[PDB]
A = this chain, B = another copy of it.
Amino acid sequence: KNSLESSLRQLKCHFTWNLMEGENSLDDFEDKVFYRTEFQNKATMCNLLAYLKHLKGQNEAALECLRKAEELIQQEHADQAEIRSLVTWGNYAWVYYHMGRLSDVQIYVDKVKHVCEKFSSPYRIESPELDCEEGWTRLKCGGNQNERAKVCFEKALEKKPKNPEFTSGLAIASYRLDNWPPSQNAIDPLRQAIRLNPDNQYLKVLLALKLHKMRGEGEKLVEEALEKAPGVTDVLRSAAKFYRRKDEPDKAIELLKKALEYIPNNAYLHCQIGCCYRAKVFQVMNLGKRKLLELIGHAVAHLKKADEANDNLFRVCSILASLHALADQYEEAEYYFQKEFSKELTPVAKQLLHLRYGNFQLYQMKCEDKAIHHFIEGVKINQKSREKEKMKDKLQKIAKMRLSKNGDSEALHVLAFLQELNEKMQ
């Protein structure tokens, strides 16, 4: 008595979760997932890949994944496949429907309906009104209970968008969530989790990293985790992070080299390691031309691969630029500086860029004039930053040393301008 769609809308699977919310870009999202899947966290994999291929218009190839998934489901979670396939089947249902295939869609809505009548609880249904009655309860509890409350109102609106009550709920919840951001007492469930799964070494590295964030336990946690599963890339990846943060670049570079052997095209890996080489450069400078030249070479090769993979996910041009700068490569430096200006930029960052480039003009190039354009355009940007305040100090310096020579006319404007900002603040 109803559109085959309306019925498909009620199935639980990837199509009915809402995974593209706020994803401006399907290529971005495709790369973001393909790069993350190279870390072997299972069959949920094949479903996520299917969902994408469908979105890429490759429906044919999507079935290819759904199929490999229900093979994994049958072999490993084998004794009980009926409930484990619920989403895989509903993904089939949706893929076929987009292929205009009414016949198999119907098959799978059947394999679903069956397993659903067989394991249905006589205790709990599904409801917008249930999710809502709960969201109000949590809201009236308040505190960390309001984040769970937002989801509640979200879940009630997916089914029935535009409702007045559920929308009240969402709005109040959200306002509270923006005003008083929730506390993540993660350190606990990480502990509970490690208790439950000692074998899983990834969990240990997260305890180890969050401890160091809230500062002996950590170092041992990572060493156990590195000891048991050196190969597992989630472990190497996040271990390396651990050491970069403890100012141990060699340990991190070593780790990430190892992970790269497993998946040598991973962009997150090239980015990470490039950054670690960059961390060694500064450290070395703090504590030699061939080494800087060779090291700077490394960071550059790696960051280039990330920038080439996906310019939006790997915003790495500033760094490549300041890096080509150290190596006295001034042409490359330019190329990458001019590339950062074309892209989107938080006023905050656009400032840091004007400063960075300004200094590059001021010290590397002979052009103080160019430097001035940026400190100025950088300071006109209304963001309270140490960077604005650093570019001020510099423009006062240059305007003064100018009136030193000729009491010149242009400076008398910059000088006043600046003095107009100091008087206000206070």
Q: With an 8 A cutoff between CB atoms, is A181 at the interface?
A: yes
Q: With an 8 A cutoff between CB atoms, is A58 at the interface?
A: no
Q: With an 8 A cutoff between CB atoms, is A335 at the interface?
A: no
Rounded to whole Å, the gap between the CB of A215 and the closest CB of chain B is 11
Q: Of B119, B175, B206, which is within 8 A of A127 by CB?
A: B119
Q: State A255–B140 Cα separation when bound (angstroms).
A: 23
Contact (Cβ within 8 A) A171 B203: yes
Contact (Cβ within 8 A) A17 B140: no
When C-beta atoms are compared, the residue in chain B nearest to A157 turns out to be B189
A151 and B142 in contact, given A86-B130, A123-B10, A171-B206 (Cβ under 8 angstroms): no
Q: Of B23, B116, B163, B184, which is within 8 A of A174 by CB?
A: B184
Contact (Cβ within 8 A) A197 B117: no
Copies of this subunit: 2
Rounded to whole Å, the gap between the CB of A80 and the closest CB of chain B is 8
When distances are taken between beta carbons in the complex, the residues of chain B under 8 Å from A14 are 137
When C-beta atoms are compared, the residue in chain B nearest to A77 turns out to be B129
Q: With an 8 A cutoff between CB atoms, is A423 at the interface?
A: no
Q: State A17–B134 Cα separation when bound (angstroms).
A: 8
Contact (Cβ within 8 A) B120 A44: no
When C-beta atoms are compared, the residue in chain B nearest to A126 turns out to be B124
Q: State A181–B115 Cα separation when bound (angstroms).
A: 38
When distances are taken between beta carbons in the complex, the residues of chain B under 8 Å from A236 are none
Q: State A130–B136 Cα separation when bound (angstroms).
A: 24
The 0/1 profile, CB within 8 Å of B marked 1, for residues 205-222 of chain A is 010011000000000000
Q: With an 8 A cutoff between CB atoms, is A133 at the interface?
A: yes
A contact set with B: CB distance below 8 Å: 7, 10-12, 14, 17, 19, 21-23, 29, 32-33, 36-37, 41-42, 44-45, 47-48, 80, 83-84, 86-87, 109, 112-113, 115-117, 119-127, 129-130, 133-134, 136-138, 140-145, 147-148, 151, 154, 162-165, 167-168, 170-172, 174-175, 177-178, 181, 184-186, 189-190, 192-194, 196-197, 200, 202-203, 206, 209-210
List, sorted by A's number, 20 A–B pairs whose CB atoms are closer than 8 Å: A10-B124, A21-B145, A29-B141, A33-B140, A44-B137, A48-B140, A83-B125, A87-B133, A115-B125, A116-B121, A116-B123, A124-B126, A125-B126, A126-B126, A147-B151, A171-B186, A172-B202, A174-B189, A175-B190, A177-B186
